[PDB]
Amino acid sequence: GEELFTGVVPILIELDGDVNGHKFFVRGEGEGDATIGKLSLKFIATTGKLPVPWPTLVTTLVQAFSRYPDHMKRHDFFKSAMPEGYVQERTIYFKDDGTYKTRAEVKFEGDTLVNRIHLCGIDFKEDGNILGHKLEYNFNSHKVYITADKQNNGIKANFTIRHNVEDGSVQLADHYQQNTPIGDLPDDHYLSTQTILSKDLNEKRDHMVLLEYVTAA
Amino acid sequence: GEELFTGVVPILIELDGDVNGHKFFVRGEGEGDATIGKLSLKFIATTGKLPVPWPTLVTTLVQAFSRYPDHMKRHDFFKSAMPEGYVQERTIYFKDDGTYKTRAEVKFEGDTLVNRIHLCGIDFKEDGNILGHKLEYNFNSHKVYITADKQNNGIKANFTIRHNVEDGSVQLADHYQQNTPIGDLPDDHYLSTQTILSKDLNEKRDHMVLLEYVTAA
Numbered sequence: 001g002e003e004l005f006t007g008v009v010p011i012l013i014e015l016d017g018d019v020n021g022h023k024f025f026v027r028g029e030g031e032g033d034a035t036i037g038k039l040s041l042k043f044i045a046t047t048g049k050l051p052v053p054w055p056t057l058v059t060t061l062v063q064a065f066s067r068y069p070d071h072m073k074r075h076d077f078f079k080s081a082m083p084e085g086y087v088q089e090r091t092i093y094f095k096d097d098g099t100y101k102t103r104a105e106v107k108f109e110g111d112t113l114v115n116r117i118h119l120c121g122i123d124f125k126e127d128g129n130i131l132g133h134k135l136e137y138n139f140n141s142h143k144v145y146i147t148a149d150k151q152n153n154g155i156k157a158n159f160t161i162r163h164n165v166e167d168g169s170v171q172l173a174d175h176y177q178q179n180t181p182i183g184d185l186p187d188d189h190y191l192s193t194q195t196i197l198s199k200d201l202n203e204k205r206d207h208m209v210l211l212e213y214v215t216a217a
Numbered sequence: 218g219e220e221l222f223t224g225v226v227p228i229l230i231e232l233d234g235d236v237n238g239h240k241f242f243v244r245g246e247g248e249g250d251a252t253i254g255k256l257s258l259k260f261i262a263t264t265g266k267l268p269v270p271w272p273t274l275v276t277t278l279v280q281a282f283s284r285y286p287d288h289m290k291r292h293d294f295f296k297s298a299m300p301e302g303y304v305q306e307r308t309i310y311f312k313d314d315g316t317y318k319t320r321a322e323v324k325f326e327g328d329t330l331v332n333r334i335h336l337c338g339i340d341f342k343e344d345g346n347i348l349g350h351k352l353e354y355n356f357n358s359h360k361v362y363i364t365a366d367k368q369n370n371g372i373k374a375n376f377t378i379r380h381n382v383e384d385g386s387v388q389l390a391d392h393y394q395q396n397t398p399i400g401d402l403p404d405d406h407y408l409s410t411q412t413i414l415s416k417d418l419n420e421k422r423d424h425m426v427l428l429e430y431v432t433a434a
Binding site: 018021089099101103118122123 | 233235237238240306318319320335336337338339340
């Protein structure tokens with residue numbers, strides 16, 4: 001399990017989403033370095049301009065890579081379910097706005113850790129912040145609180161993402177998360193994440209480039 | 218807006234659904250006769266064989282046509298929202314299997330009554346009853362209990378639907394419904410239904426012929 005994260009792992013991320021009937025697909029490639037908690041990825045919208053802002057897809061697109069210090073390592077469930085992998089499900093509610101429903105399977109395929117994801121949504125207002133692309137291209141820094149679920153031999157987690165709207169207002173998005181092994185269990189803690197969104201100057205297609213630091217405490 | 222149902226009304230139903238990443242589109246044409254509560258429709262999968270049993274989509278696919286008796290017309294929320302229309306949102310839990318989430322707008326477009334729908338699912342098992350196409354091609358009458366929702370200026374409804382399996386077992390389908398006007402709330406009452414699913418012998422495409430009688434009480 002932990003054995004696989006002693007260094008830099010290749011990453012493939014795939015996501016087909018359907019939001020309000022708008023189909024899109026995002027291929028993500030990059031490295032992951034758990035030892036320091038760094039993620040470095042380049043996402044490409046193979047289907048053209050996204051119907052939905054890149055920051056709304058940031059959480060959905062590998063925690064395994066989050067850096068758990070040795071005080072904590074017992075409690076790192078994500079690695080401990082590998083290489084078999086784990087299943088990750090979120091219900092993301094965008095306040096005064098639509099809902100995402102996601103299922104994703106995070107496992108090793110060959111040497112590369114893969115996140116294949118299905119994302120669905122409805123009841124998104126056109127001319128709202130999300131379909132309206134009224135969200136700033138940035139990402140905040142959130143504590144993500146983690147509890148174990150002895151019942152499904154896995155992890156639940158709750159948190160709210162604050163998106164800056166071009167107003168100066170904030171578009172809240174409540175997350176509800178479930179994970180289960182697909183094949184261990186921690187005591188309550190959280191993950192503090194930091195995230196930077198960026199673009200490639202040589203990229204005709206709609207894209208996002210992502211740098212992240214996640215350590216646990 | 219009840220004056221709009223005093224005879225035969227053309228219907229158009231379109232449904233964009235996802236399930237486990239499996240995209241599909243269903244187009245329905247037919248007629249409703251509100252005076253007797255008759256619905257006759259032909260639904261066609263324009264995307265090829267469904268990833269999902271036809272009977273799970275009936276009851277996502279125009280109550281407005283429900284026959285409300287003369288002593289009850291002051292409670293017919295569906296007509297009378299109208300033309301301008303209403304929004305109908307369902308959450309359907311398939312016991313021991315996935316969930317549908319659906320939002321649909323039912324309005325008059327021209328002098329046709331149109332039902333445009335989005336359907337999202339996830340948490341469905343392959344080799345389960347629903348991705349497994351293990352359901353009898355029928356649909357049994359169920360009383361549907363309707364209540365008013367003061368908060369949202371509209372209608373709530375709760376009901377379970379018994380789906381016969383090839384086994385002799387039954388897939389329960391828990392429906393949770395909300396309706397809200399787009400543009401008079403009823404005292405508690407119900408709609409009892411009756412459905413015959415039959416096939417066109419001159420149709421190549423995956424289809425479903427529906428005949429339905431609904432009256433209120």
